């Protein structure tokens, strides 16, 4: 929005590096909120005219960044946007230093290429044509990424782990983390490699020089004020240019001249990059003449890359949870120190054990949290899915309330047939027009095949009865969907032209030629039920061809009924999710389907604005009260913003008759209200929609093709869509639960003199890793389409209450077990001077270890979700077998001592509490916990806060509540 620029240069050199090195450690914590850092010695507060370093200060825009200034008059880079500094106005200007306004074209016509101006300044200006395309080596990127807080924590954790006499134990997991970082490096390198797909290859083109000399130079160099040359060999035009002479067929010249440039109706002369050239007409020689407009980086080709690179997108809850853990550790450190001092151990080598315990208090359940969702991508590959190269935003897209659909080139499926004769009442002109209506979409091919015509993939057969031969054709673009073709009719009798397009588009140009009286009501009655119509016109001879045209009739066709999407829509409707579609075929072809599918029970009406004049109103036109949004309607009422634009999109049902150019704007507007709206389309008219959409769906996109952010391989969409989000939420809950449990157990089980089996620490790592906790990452199709929607937030009243009860119960049972030693033989252990590493498991260490392990197993068995949330635990045979084996081996330790007692050297246990008391207490605890979980997870949140769930900042619920006042 708005901000300020300030800075200052260095005063001298010789001790700045020394100061930085000495004060390096505090600077690590200053990475966040650099505002405090600008007040240090780094800013001597010199004059603003000479700074050599641009620092952005937040005034109206948040999310401050860091900028760098370099000297090749001064310039600096900011998010890929080049800025030029001038000493005449004391300000920074964009790439258009003097091209901000629309100057006259007389100067552009009178130019004669380069002049005697110094090339040094012409290079100091914004410079050559290149793109960001950053490349880094493996060691460089490795060292750069080593400073991230996430990676730094792992290094500290492993370093402190090594101090606790664990070399073969922690080294393996450290190597696993390192190879995971290597996989992340590959992840971030593959995207960089893909970025290099849009860059063209270097080629030599002619460059004009003043007076009478011409030279050839590579495209790597170019400066403003030169006549560019585009040879036929060149496929990609190096930079944006506007034709000045000749003609092009991607454009015409301007030999007549014009006054002030408007760039509104004279767009036929400007040519943009990123589009191939088919044919060009050259007046002089085989080359062309043009200008050099906005060029190089920051252009369209580079502009799209910059827009998708720098500003590309709920971590506040995670940060708050991390801070909570940190404060808990800080407040428990004093207690741990007091307990250690209670044992009278003032040795220096042992006090650091308290700090080691503080460091290890936090479990490693933070680097390893996405292992579960990786296997889901494998399952999608196994059966089906739209997995991308690097799927990492499943949780982000877990929330959604609107699902889009496409019909222009997605529905219906392939297949079409003719119905009957035209309603004009076989006809010469009709057959002649139809014969040339081909793109050799497959729809035209099917039509020509059905009508009985054979044509070359220009030449055509059956000449004697109907001589037809194609001569020239125009390309089909996204906006203004139409196809005009010029054929070689002059042979028969005279030149003729034909064009096919939507009736609405052609209705705007046939007014002065001929307007049939029965064109509106008849068309409405005919197309009111499914049928789609296109308008055909002829001209007996891109603006030149659209001068005069005559309509030849209508066209009735039917694609298919596709009796497979309706069940999908009905199932989606049962989840309180509204379904919408976007297309540009016809409003009457989209309203008809809306009345025979599960999104609205009653008949929905539509509203049409009067015209583009400033006297627009809001009339009431007929076909629970949801309105239908038409193209021109919003295209015209895009004006005054405080007219409650956000408050009408929700009430709308269909957004159609909308040119694909505004797909990105529509997606941004929908997403601006914290509403994640997906996309479901194909073709070249949904590139921007998918690029600017967090989640996208495609059907016609196959493998080995990178066009959409999500690449596919209509009915198998919702089944794999909602299930994926539900499973992601379930696994995230499965982690956070039992992660809090691991934290509290590690913090609590340290009973002053219990080492928890230092040599047996692997007994838990090989109970959690690969067997049997991280397992059960299976697909979770409940086979039901109910209204189940678990929360996607780590904090929530039901989960929090369940966790509080869980810690209360575990603390109580642990205290009871600890106090149970009173009614048992004392058996006082050895005296002090060991305090831990003596490894003296006699009657408490192994007992507590086994009890804790069994408690983890019981919680995992009971905490599992039910049938409606996930599949039953008895359906996955491997997981059930693993759980049974683990339970059997655990029970065998306390069942009877055999040969296993040799290596581990388990001590004897009194028969009084060997088979009765422990079994009774553990089974009672298990049944109590199961009953508590069943009671709590049944209907707690509903009966608690169904009506007023403390509405504070819930935006979606805010709109939901506001909708009531609009009824």
């Amino acid at each position: 929005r708005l901000s300020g620029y300030c800075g200052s240069p260095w005063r001298v050199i010789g001790y700045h590096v020394v100061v930085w090195m000495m004060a390096g450690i505090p600077l690590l914590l200053f990475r966040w909120k650099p505002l405090w850092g600008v007040r240090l010695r780094l800013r001597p507060c010199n004059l603003a005219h000479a700074e050599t370093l641009v620092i952005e200060i937040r005034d109206k825009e948040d999310s401050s960044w860091q900028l760098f200034t370099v000297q090749v008059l001064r310039y600096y880079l900011f998010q890929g946007q080049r800025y030029i500094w001038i000493e005449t106005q004391q300000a920074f200007y964009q790439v258009s230093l003097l091209d901000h306004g629309r100057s006259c074209d007389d100067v552009h016509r009178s130019r004669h290429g380069l002049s005697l101006q110094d090339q040094m300044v012409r290079k100091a200006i914004y410079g050559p044509n290149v793109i960001s395309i950053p490349v880094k080596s493996y060691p460089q990127l490795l060292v750069d990424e080593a400073l991230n807080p996430y990676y730094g924590f792992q290094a500290f954790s492993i370093a402190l782990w090594l101090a606790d006499h664990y070399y073969w134990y922690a080294l393996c997991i450290f190597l696993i983390s390192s190879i995971s970082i290597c996989l992340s490096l590959y992840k971030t390198r593959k995207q960089s490699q893909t970025l290099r797909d849009m860059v063209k290859l270097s080629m030599r083109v002619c460059v004009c020089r003043p007076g009478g000399e011409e030279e050839w130079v590579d495209s790597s160099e170019l400066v403003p004020g030169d006549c560019l040359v585009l040879p036929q060999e060149g496929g990609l035009m190096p930079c944006d240019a506007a034709l000045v002479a000749g003609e092009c067929m991607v454009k015409t010249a301007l030999p007549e001249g014009l006054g002030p440039y408007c760039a509104e109706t004279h767009r036929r002369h400007t040519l943009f990059c990123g589009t191939l050239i088919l044919q060009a007409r050259a007046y002089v020689g085989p080359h062309v003449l043009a200008v050099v407009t906005r060029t190089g980086f920051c252009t369209a080709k580079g502009g799209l890359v910059s827009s998708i690179l720098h500003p590309r997108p709920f971590y506040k809850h995670s940060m708050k949870f991390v801070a909570a853990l940190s404060v808990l550790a800080l407040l428990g450190t004093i207690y741990s120190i007091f307990i250690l001092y209670r044992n009278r151990v003032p040795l220096n080598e042992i006090v650091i054990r308290a700090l080691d315990l503080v460091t290890v208090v936090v479990p490693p359940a933070l680097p390893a949290a996405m292992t579960v969702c990786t296997l889901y991508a494998q399952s999608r590959l196994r059966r089906q899915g739209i997995f991308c190269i690097h799927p990492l935003r499943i949780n982000l897209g877990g929330k959604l309330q609107l699902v889009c659909f496409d019909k222009t080139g997605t529905l219906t499926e392939d297949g079409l047939d003719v119905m009957g004769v035209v309603p004009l009442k076989p006809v010469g002109p009709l057959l002649r027009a139809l014969a040339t209506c081909h793109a050799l979409d497959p729809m035209d091919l099917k039509m020509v095949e059905s009508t009985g015509w054979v044509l070359e993939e220009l030449q055509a057969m059956e000449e004697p009865p109907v001589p037809v031969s194609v001569l020239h054709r125009f390309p089909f673009s996204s906006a203004l969907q139409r196809m005009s073709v010029v054929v070689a009719w002059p042979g028969a009798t005279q030149p003729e032209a034909y064009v096919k397009g939507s009736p609405e588009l052609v209705a705007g140009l046939c007014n002065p030629e001929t307007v049939p009286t029965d064109f509106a009501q008849m068309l409405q009655s005919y197309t009111a039920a499914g049928y789609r119509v296109v308008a055909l016109a002829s001209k007996p001879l891109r603006d030149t061809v659209e001068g005069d045209l005559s309509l030849l009739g209508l066209l009735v066709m039917r694609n298919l009924l596709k009796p497979q999407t309706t069940p999908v829509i009905q199932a989606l409707r049962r989840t309180r999710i509204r379904a919408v579609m976007v297309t540009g075929d016809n409003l009457q072809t989209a309203v008809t389907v809306a009345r025979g599918c599960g999104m609205v029970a009653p008949q929905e009406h539509l509203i049409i604005v009067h015209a583009t004049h400033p006297e627009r109103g809001q009339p009431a036109s007929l076909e629970s009260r949801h309105l239908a949004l038409s193209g021109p309607t919003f295209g015209i009422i895009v004006k005054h913003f405080p007219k409650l634009l956000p408050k009408v999109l929700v009430q709308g049902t269909v957004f159609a008759r909308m040119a694909p150019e505004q797909k990105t704007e529509l997606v941004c507007e929908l997403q601006k209200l914290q509403y994640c709206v997906g996309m479901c389309g194909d073709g070249a008219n949904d590139c921007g929609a998918l690029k600017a959409a967090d989640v996208g769906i495609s059907l016609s996109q196959a493998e080995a093709s990178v066009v959409s952010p999500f690449t596919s391989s209509v009915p198998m969409v919702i089944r794999e869509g909602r299930c994926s989000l539900d499973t992601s939420f379930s696994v995230f809950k499965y982690m956070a639960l039992y992660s809090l449990t691991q934290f509290i157990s590690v913090l609590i089980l340290y009973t002053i003199n219990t080492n928890l089996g230092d040599l047996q620490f692997l007994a838990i790592d090989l109970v959690i890793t690969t067997t049997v906790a991280v397992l059960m990452s299976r697909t979770g199709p409940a086979l039901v389409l109910g209204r189940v929607r678990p929360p996607g937030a780590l904090l929530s009243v039901p989960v929090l209450s369940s966790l509080l009860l869980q810690m209360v119960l575990v603390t109580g049972v642990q205290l009871g077990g600890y106090f149970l030693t009173l009614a048992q033989p004392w058996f006082v252990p050895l005296n002090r001077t060991v305090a831990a590493p003596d490894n003296l498991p006699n009657y408490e260490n192994t007992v507590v270890f086994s009890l804790s392990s069994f408690q983890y197993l019981i919680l995992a068995a009971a905490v599992s979700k039910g049938a409606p949330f996930r599949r039953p635990l008895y359906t996955n045979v491997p997981f059930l077998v693993a759980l049974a084996l683990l339970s059997s081996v655990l029970v065998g330790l306390v069942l009877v001592p055999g040969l296993l007692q040799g290596p581990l050297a388990l001590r004897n246990i009194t028969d009084t509490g060997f088979k009765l008391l422990l079994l009774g207490l553990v089974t009672l605890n298990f049944v109590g916990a199961f009953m508590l979980e069943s009671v709590l997870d049944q209907c707690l949140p509903a009966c608690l806060r169904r009506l007023r769930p403390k509405r504070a900042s819930k935006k979606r619920f805010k709109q939901l509540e506001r909708e009531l006042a609009e009824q």
Side-chain angles (χ1 to χ4, degrees):
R1 292 160 275 191
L2 190 71
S3 184
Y5 75 95
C6 202
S8 175
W10 312 85
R11 57 181 83 83
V12 292
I13 202 78
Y15 56 88
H16 280 157
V17 287
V18 180
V19 174
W20 198 297
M21 291 305 248
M22 295 298 102
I25 296 95
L27 205 69
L28 274 296
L29 302 173
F30 292 166
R31 297 296 193 84
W32 51 83
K33 302 290 185 66
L35 179 48
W36 294 110
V38 301
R39 302 181 182 181
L40 305 174
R41 56 101 183 169
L42 277 292
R43 180 72 199 274
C45 286
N46 292 125
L47 295 173
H49 84 277
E51 303 181 350
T52 65
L53 182 63
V54 187
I55 300 100
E56 189 262 327
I57 180 59
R58 293 166 52 183
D59 191 43
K60 210 162 75 70
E61 180 63 33
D62 305 331
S63 63
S64 194
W65 300 283
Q66 187 61 68
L67 284 77
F68 190 94
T69 309
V70 69
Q71 176 56 26
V72 66
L73 275 291
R74 313 306 303 275
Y75 64 110
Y76 66 101
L77 276 75
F78 175 54
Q79 297 193 95
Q81 307 303 326
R82 290 183 63 82
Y83 277 130
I84 193 66
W85 160 263
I86 55 175
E87 89 302 358
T88 60
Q89 291 290 336
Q90 192 269 329
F92 299 90
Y93 293 158
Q94 284 73 11
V95 70
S96 48
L97 75 165
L98 287 163
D99 213 321
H100 290 293
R102 291 289 186 185
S103 51
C104 275
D105 206 52
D106 296 357
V107 292
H108 296 170
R109 191 178 179 182
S110 66
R111 72 188 176 87
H112 202 299
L114 211 72
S115 315
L116 301 171
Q117 205 72 26
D118 302 332
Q119 311 306 328
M120 171 85 208
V121 187
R122 289 223 177 196
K123 295 281 278 180
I125 57 172
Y126 294 97
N129 164 22
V130 294
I131 304 298
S132 177
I133 189 64
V135 63
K136 296 183 180 181
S137 80
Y138 201 92
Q140 292 175 355
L141 183 63
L142 182 62
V143 297
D144 288 336
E145 285 282 339
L147 304 174
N148 291 333
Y150 296 168
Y151 184 74
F153 190 90
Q154 283 284 70
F156 187 81
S157 57
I158 61 179
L160 277 296
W161 265 107
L162 291 165
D164 199 1
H165 182 74
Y166 295 119
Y167 171 77
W168 169 90
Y169 159 75
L171 189 150
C172 77
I173 192 72
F174 168 47
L175 193 147
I176 291 164
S177 299
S178 300
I179 193 66
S180 70
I181 294 297
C182 166
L183 277 296
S184 86
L185 188 142
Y186 181 76
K187 254 161 190 193
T188 189
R189 168 58 28 82
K190 192 161 174 184
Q191 63 84 30
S192 79
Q193 285 188 358
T194 67
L195 266 297
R196 207 187 299 184
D197 183 275
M198 315 189 174
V199 71
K200 73 178 206 299
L201 274 290
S202 306
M203 51 155 178
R204 302 177 183 178
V205 296
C206 171
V207 69
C208 173
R209 275 279 285 193
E213 62 273 16
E214 298 286 327
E215 204 176 7
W216 60 68
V217 190
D218 58 351
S219 49
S220 184
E221 68 94 26
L222 58 92
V223 296
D226 291 331
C227 295
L228 191 60
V229 173
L230 310 171
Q232 294 183 357
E233 290 203 8
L236 281 72
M237 65 180 288
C239 49
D240 293 332
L243 188 151
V244 70
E247 201 185 13
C248 280
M249 293 182 178
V250 66
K251 309 293 174 71
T252 190
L254 276 164
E256 314 178 20
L258 210 73
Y261 209 79
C262 194
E264 283 289 89
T265 44
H266 293 269
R267 61 179 173 79
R268 303 164 295 172
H269 317 103
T270 189
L271 183 63
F272 51 87
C273 176
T275 309
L276 76 165
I277 185 64
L278 306 174
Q279 194 181 30
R281 190 173 72 184
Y283 273 37
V284 173
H287 80 299
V288 302
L289 298 166
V291 298
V292 57
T293 81
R294 52 191 305 284
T295 180
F297 200 39
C298 183
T299 189
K301 172 175 74 180
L304 266 291
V305 170
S306 49
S307 49
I308 62 170
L309 273 177
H310 303 279
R312 188 183 275 288
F314 293 99
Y315 292 143
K316 303 298 296 189
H317 301 163
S318 278
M319 296 295 285
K320 286 185 178 182
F321 170 73
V322 173
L325 294 174
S326 282
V327 62
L328 267 296
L330 286 165
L331 58 91
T333 306
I334 194 78
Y335 172 83
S336 76
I337 290 166
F338 178 80
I339 299 298
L340 182 76
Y341 204 88
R342 187 181 177 282
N343 206 17
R344 189 161 36 70
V345 183
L347 191 65
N348 190 4
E349 210 71 29
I350 296 164
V351 290
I352 191 161
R353 184 152 172 72
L355 286 88
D356 303 337
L357 191 149
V358 168
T359 68
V360 69
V361 75
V362 66
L366 174 145
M370 61 295 278
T371 52
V372 63
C373 59
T374 61
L375 276 67
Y376 270 59
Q378 174 264 321
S379 301
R380 295 313 96 68
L381 267 298
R382 192 198 61 72
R383 59 184 195 250
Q384 68 278 334
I386 198 178
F387 85 104
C388 58
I389 302 95
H390 309 296
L392 289 154
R393 311 187 317 290
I394 307 305
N395 300 56
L396 277 291
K399 274 77 76 177
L400 75 174
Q401 281 80 9
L402 293 169
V403 180
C404 281
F405 285 95
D406 192 0
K407 206 196 290 189
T408 303
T410 292
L411 308 171
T412 74
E413 296 293 334
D414 303 328
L416 186 148
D417 284 315
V418 70
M419 320 312 307
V421 305
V422 298
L424 296 171
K425 273 82 76 167
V427 176
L430 273 167
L431 285 164
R432 291 174 171 201
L434 188 153
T436 185
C437 294
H438 63 87
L440 282 82
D441 187 74
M443 151 175 188
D444 304 332
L445 188 153
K446 177 37 191 163
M447 201 179 254
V448 298
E449 191 276 331
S450 185
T451 51
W453 300 97
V454 180
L455 293 94
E456 187 175 2
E457 303 102 308
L458 304 166
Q459 189 173 3
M461 303 324 148
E462 300 292 350
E463 299 295 88
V466 187
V468 301
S469 307
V470 176
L471 181 61
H472 190 55
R473 42 179 296 118
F474 291 167
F476 187 82
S477 200
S478 297
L480 189 59
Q481 301 177 0
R482 62 184 181 179
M483 185 180 288
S484 80
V485 298
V486 187
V487 293
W489 261 125
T493 56
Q494 59 180 20
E496 301 288 322
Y498 300 90
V499 60
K500 69 189 288 185
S502 305
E504 300 177 357
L505 264 171
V506 68
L509 56 91
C510 278
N511 309 77
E513 196 273 324
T514 296
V515 294
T517 312
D518 217 335
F519 196 73
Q521 67 288 31
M522 191 285 258
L523 186 155
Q524 158 69 58
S525 159
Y526 200 78
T527 67
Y531 274 140
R532 183 169 63 162
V533 60
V534 296
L536 279 294
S538 47
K539 177 185 70 142
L541 62 86
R542 204 175 187 179
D543 195 11
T544 184
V545 71
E546 301 296 330
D548 49 351
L549 299 93
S550 299
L551 290 168
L552 58 85
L554 300 185
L555 185 146
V556 67
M557 288 284 123
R558 182 183 65 179
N559 310 330
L560 203 63
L561 303 189
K562 51 169 199 300
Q564 294 83 16
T565 308
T566 303
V568 176
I569 301 299
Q570 286 281 21
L572 178 56
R573 183 220 164 190
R574 220 151 73 186
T575 52
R576 295 169 56 184
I577 294 165
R578 318 211 172 285
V580 304
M581 71 225 78
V582 296
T583 185
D585 300 330
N586 192 0
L587 79 166
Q588 299 178 2
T589 57
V591 70
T592 183
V593 59
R595 201 176 64 80
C597 274
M599 83 306 287
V600 60
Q603 303 184 11
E604 61 88 8
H605 311 299
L606 59 90
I607 185 169
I608 47 172
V609 297
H610 201 70
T612 65
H613 297 281
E615 301 294 335
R616 66 196 60 75
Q618 303 296 329
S621 59
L622 311 193
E623 186 174 0
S624 177
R625 64 104 175 175
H626 289 62
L627 73 165
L629 192 67
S630 172
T633 54
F634 64 91
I636 287 154
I637 68 153
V638 159
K639 62 176 70 177
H640 302 96
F641 162 77
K643 206 199 292 186
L644 278 66
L645 259 66
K647 309 299 295 188
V648 57
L649 63 92
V650 180
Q651 197 61 227
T653 60
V654 305
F655 314 139
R657 320 288 86 67
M658 183 278 288
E661 306 307 285
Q662 314 190 243
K663 275 279 192 53
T664 184
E665 274 76 29
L666 187 137
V667 171
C668 285
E669 286 177 354
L670 294 174
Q671 289 177 351
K672 265 185 165 225
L673 306 173
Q674 287 196 350
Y675 265 95
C676 296
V677 190
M679 281 324 317
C680 176
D682 66 329
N685 55 13
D686 290 314
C687 172
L690 294 161
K691 281 285 180 187
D694 301 329
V695 65
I697 303 297
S698 299
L699 306 175
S700 282
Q701 298 178 358
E703 301 283 13
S705 85
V706 178
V707 296
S708 170
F710 292 166
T711 308
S712 182
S713 63
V714 59
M716 295 296 172
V717 169
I718 193 66
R719 183 68 275 179
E720 303 299 331
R722 186 74 192 78
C723 174
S724 300
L725 319 185
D726 200 343
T727 51
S728 85
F729 281 25
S730 82
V731 300
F732 163 83
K733 294 290 194 299
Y734 274 118
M735 295 298 102
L737 306 172
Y738 163 100
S739 295
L740 290 184
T741 300
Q742 194 164 9
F743 195 106
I744 60 158
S745 299
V746 176
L747 182 53
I748 293 281
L749 268 291
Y750 189 87
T751 55
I752 67 173
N753 57 2
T754 300
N755 64 7
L756 311 163
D758 291 329
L759 262 174
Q760 309 306 76
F761 280 10
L762 79 168
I764 295 158
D765 266 325
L766 193 149
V767 160
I768 303 167
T769 66
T770 306
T771 58
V772 68
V774 177
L775 272 291
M776 52 175 208
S777 168
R778 308 286 88 192
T779 189
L783 305 170
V784 293
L785 276 288
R787 300 161 59 179
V788 175
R789 187 273 304 278
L794 63 94
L795 62 89
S796 59
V797 190
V799 171
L800 279 168
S801 51
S802 68
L803 276 153
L804 270 296
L805 294 174
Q806 287 158 15
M807 51 204 97
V808 170
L809 271 296
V810 66
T811 48
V813 66
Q814 286 290 349
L815 192 68
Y818 182 45
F819 290 164
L820 266 169
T821 311
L822 188 65
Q824 287 302 323
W826 279 59
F827 204 100
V828 179
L830 184 60
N831 296 24
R832 306 292 176 275
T833 316
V834 286
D838 185 44
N839 289 319
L840 56 87
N842 290 16
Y843 289 93
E844 60 283 339
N845 186 80
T846 47
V847 169
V848 299
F849 204 110
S850 71
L851 282 164
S852 185
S853 71
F854 203 64
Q855 217 182 20
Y856 295 120
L857 300 204
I858 288 283
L859 188 153
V863 75
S864 281
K865 308 295 291 195
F869 264 101
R870 276 175 51 77
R871 281 195 165 285
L873 281 293
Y874 50 77
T875 54
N876 46 12
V877 168
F879 200 77
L880 201 74
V881 168
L883 278 168
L885 180 77
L886 188 56
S887 310
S888 48
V889 65
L890 199 152
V891 168
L893 306 179
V894 292
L895 182 74
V896 289
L899 206 72
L900 188 146
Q901 207 182 30
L904 301 189
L906 266 289
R907 284 287 302 177
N908 194 272
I909 306 101
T910 58
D911 186 74
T912 64
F914 182 76
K915 204 74 181 291
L916 173 61
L917 294 174
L918 78 168
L919 299 194
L921 64 92
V922 76
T923 190
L924 294 174
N925 190 2
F926 155 59
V927 63
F930 198 81
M931 182 255 268
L932 187 153
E933 194 67 21
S934 309
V935 172
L936 195 145
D937 69 348
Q938 259 177 0
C939 60
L940 271 287
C943 177
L944 189 153
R945 261 159 205 193
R946 210 153 199 166
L947 307 189
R948 40 171 68 84
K950 293 201 80 65
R951 279 286 100 82
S953 297
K954 292 272 188 174
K955 199 63 167 62
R956 58 219 188 197
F957 285 105
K958 191 260 183 184
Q959 284 76 242
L960 191 147
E961 191 67 25
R962 276 282 185 280
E963 284 161 12
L964 300 168
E966 298 178 352
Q967 298 177 1

